[PDB]
Design a protein around this ligand. Structure first.
Ligand SMILES: CON(C)C(=O)N1N=C(c2cc(F)ccc2F)S[C@@]1(CCCN)c1ccccc1
Ligand SMILES: Nc1ncnc2c1ncn2[C@@H]1O[C@H](COP(=O)(O)OP(=O)(O)O)[C@@H](O)[C@H]1O
Ligand SMILES: [Mg+2]
Length: 328
């Protein structure tokens, strides 16, 4: 009996916004875990909409704070042999990818292990090896990376040199809420020093996919899966899904569209839940009311221009707090 945990992260003003003299309409209070939105513009200076969350990160939050506070507890439950999912949800430009992946600091000032701008994926891989090596247990780590665009499936770590070769998806007859990704390459990570070269190749395939399909970065969903096998004889198996969704400001929007419908259906206790109607909600079905521990990172902008999309994100995120999973 475990509810889905949801956090909110507000980014600082960007440069376009500073030049346009944007006003803030967001107040993020981490102590009381509240986000408050100024909704009345020039007409009603006093009206607000306020939501309470499991945690709230204001503009000044460092990447390392997201990792320590959110990723470590989940990583520990993966090392204990459970299934866990984290996805970033919010409008384009609000920090979904900065949170899940991060950036490299310019001028080559840092190693990739120490860069303060790295996000969840690079820290998770480095720290899995740190925790288990010189910890006394036998383990193998494998990772995969598929992407969803226009309800087609692409393998961004595949040995094939053409990124456009499509994957295919079938119900898993071994697990009642799972899928099989026919064709998906799973690459073994032998140690921490292999982590960066694997990311490099996936980044290169992503760049080429951008030249082939319209608005690729913002209309595709990203699913980075790491699986851990541990032998202590007692052998546990953990799996962690790290998902970066497409922009929530929306043929093409089918997974995003269904995802809301699926959420509304679970929290309204409707009988039939339309998991089957999109590729995304099929992959994530054990993560939306199944037996997987799930956490949502909802990203938003402080600027007045984005009032409607900020409200839309908060309401979707707040409503998903009412969904229960039953992990292992
Ligand atoms: C240019 O060199 N490369 C390959 C990188 O810088 N990275 N590769 C990443 C990555 C790639 C994927 F295909 C899938 C998932 C991922 F997380 S993470 C990232 C940043 C990527 C841009 N957001 C990074 C690592 C370490 C410190 C700071 C940033
Ligand atoms: N939390 C943050 N702190 C500082 N800068 C951020 C933050 N989140 C996003 N940004 C900046 O905003 C830009 C867009 O963020 P990104 O993650 O690419 O958006 P999306 O939500 O579309 O993936 C990036 O260039 C990044 O530098
Ligand atoms: Mg993006």
């Amino acid at each position: 009996g475990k509810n889905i945990q949801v956090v909110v992260r507000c980014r600082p003003f960007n440069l376009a916004e500073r030049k346009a003299s944007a006003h803030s309409i967001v107040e993020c209070d981490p102590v009381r875990k509240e986000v408050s939105v100024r909704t009345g513009g020039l007409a009603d200076k006093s009206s607000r909409k306020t939501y309470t969350f499991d945690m709230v990160f204001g503009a000044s939050t460092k990447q390392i704070d997201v990792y320590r506070s959110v990723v470590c507890p989940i990583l520990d439950e993966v090392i204990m042999g459970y299934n866990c999912t984290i996805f970033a949800y919010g409008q384009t430009g609000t920090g979904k990818t900065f949170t899940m992946e991060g950036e490299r600091s310019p001028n080559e000032e840092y190693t990739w292990e120490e860069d303060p701008l790295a996000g969840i994926i690079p820290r998770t891989l480095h720290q899995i090896f740190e925790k288990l090596t010189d910890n006394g247990t036998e383990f193998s780590v494998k990772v995969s990376l598929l992407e969803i665009y226009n309800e087609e499936l692409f393998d961004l770590l595949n040995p094939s040199s053409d990124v456009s070769e499509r994957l295919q998806m079938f119900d898993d007859p071994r697990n009642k809420r799972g899928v099989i990704i026919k064709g998906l390459e799973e690459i073994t990570v032998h140690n921490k020093d292999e982590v960066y070269q694997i990311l490099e190749k996936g980044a290169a395939k992503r760049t080429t996919a951008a030249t082939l399909m319209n608005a690729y970065s913002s209309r595709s969903h990203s699913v980075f899966s790491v699986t851990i096998h541990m032998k202590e004889e007692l052998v546990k198996i953990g799996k962690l899904n790290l998902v970066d969704l497409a922009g929530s400001e929306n043929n093409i929007n089918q997974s995003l569209l269904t995802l809301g419908r699926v959420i509304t259906a679970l929290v309204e206790r409707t009988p039939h839940v339309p998991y089957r109607e999109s590729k995304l909600t099929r992959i994530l079905q054990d993560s939306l009311g199944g037996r997987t521990r799930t956490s949502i990172i909802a990203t938003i902008s402080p600027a007045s221009l984005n009032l409607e999309e900020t409200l839309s994100t908060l309401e979707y995120a707040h409503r998903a707090k009412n969904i229960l999973n039953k992990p292992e």
